[PDB]
């Protein structure tokens, strides 16, 4: 994913 | 310790309420969402879809107030036995001032999820003292294709539904994977990698287990929603899909907060798709540099994180960890 999500 | 308030065990046919405290996965990954619901329905549970299911607000499911309302409606519903996040994201911590902790205390339920939902799992435990569960989120965990979903499901039942004598041994899964495939649709079989836990630093520790997703913990640290870490606690931490720079920051965050002066031992989850930034270092090697000359028993590559399969882990209860022999036992009841 491009994201920094948890 | 004395007997304390505890949630009722899950029963077949119970209602699992699902909510989206951050990312709108029920809109953006509909196939895996529908597959996950069907997996649990086929097993005989009922699913109560929270009020933001299917809604979309870009990076989130809805406004702060809308998401608090979604979760509180499940907390206040006496027909719901288990409250499960659909997925994490980043923004669960926004809800914390607005959650009906009094209603939860009045009618405790199994609160389960992982990653960003750590903010809520620890917030509820901090405010109510009721153990919460680091474990499956609906879409990542129960939307997984066979075979791994069946192992995750087995551990979920063993911990939340089956009666367990104490000490309760947490068995090591035999196989694992973190492959970045088969999200919405299956294209091939994931590798059944032989699984092990790691004895990073020998020894044993017995204490209350506290923790969850370490990246998420930094968004609630210091607040009324972060349980105080106490002398002798066992720290459980995991991060997923991050890099060496990120986890060094988080490990030093714990160090400068004195956490490693208090804890008796550390359980470190596997790190899904870890980016070592070219160093070829393992997450536990970076942690051990941060620890410097402080020796702490440490069991790593624990299967309670974004890798498959996932163990369901009670938080806030006494545990024994044996890093030398790579065992974990739960020593205190977590459900009725
Ligand atoms: P967070 O709770 O957002 O994520 C937990 C794990 O779910 C998997 N995951 C989330 N979103 C995706 C997409 N879009 N594609 C593939 N995998 C996804 C990862 O295992 C996350 O660590």
């Amino acid at each position: 994913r491009t994201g920094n999500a948890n | 310790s004395n007997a304390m308030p505890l949630p009722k065990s899950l029963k077949y046919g119970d209602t699992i309420g699902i909510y989206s405290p951050s990312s709108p996965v029920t809109y953006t990954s509909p196939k895996r969402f529908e597959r996950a619901k069907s997996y649990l329905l086929q097993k005989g549970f009922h699913i109560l879809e929270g009020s933001l299911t299917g809604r979309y607000d870009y990076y989130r499911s809805g406004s702060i107030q809308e998401r608090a309302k979604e979760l509180n409606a499940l907390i206040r519903n006496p027909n719901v036995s288990c409250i499960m996040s659909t997925i994490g994201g980043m923004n669960s911590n926004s809800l914390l001032p607005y959650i009906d902790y009094d209603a939860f205390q009045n009618n405790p339920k199994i609160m389960i999820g992982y990653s960003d939902a750590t903010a809520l799992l620890l917030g509820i435990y901090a405010k109510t003292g009721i153990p919460t569960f680091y474990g499956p989120a609906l879409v990542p965990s129960f939307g997984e294709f066979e075979p791994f979903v069946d192992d995750t499901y087995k551990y979920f039942l063993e911990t939340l539904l089956h009666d367990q004598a104490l000490p309760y041994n947490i068995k090591q899964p035999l196989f694992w994977s973190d492959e970045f495939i088969n999200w919405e649709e299956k294209t091939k079989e994931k590798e059944l990698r032989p699984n092990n836990w790691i004895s990073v630093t020998n020894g044993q520790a017995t204490g209350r287990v506290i923790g969850g997703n370490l990246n998420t913990i930094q968004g609630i640290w210091g607040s009324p929603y972060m349980p105080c870490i106490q002398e002798g606690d066992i720290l459980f931490i995991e991060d997923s899909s991050k890099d060496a720079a990120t986890i060094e920051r988080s490990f030093s965050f714990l160090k400068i907060n004195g956490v490693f002066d208090k804890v008796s031992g550390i359980i470190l989850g596997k790190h899904e798709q870890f980016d070592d930034c070219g160093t070829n270092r393992k997450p536990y090697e970076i942690l051990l540099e941060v620890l410097q000359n402080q020796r702490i028993p440490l069991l790593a590559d624990f299967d309670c994180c974004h890798t498959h399969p996932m163990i369901t882990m009670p938080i806030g209860v006494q545990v024994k960890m044996d890093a030398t022999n790579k065992t974990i036992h739960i020593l205190e009841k977590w459900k009725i």
Side-chain angles (χ1 to χ4, degrees), chain A residues 1 5-6, chain B residues 87-89 114 140 180 183 240-241 272:
Chain A
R1 311 151 81 188
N6 296 308
Chain B
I87 199 156
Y114 76 101
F180 195 77
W183 184 248
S240 302
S241 290
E272 171 195 48

Side-chain angles (χ1 to χ4, degrees), chain B residues 13-27:
Chain B
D14 275 354
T15 295
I16 301 169
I18 61 168
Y19 70 107
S20 298
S22 187
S23 301
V25 67
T26 64
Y27 183 87

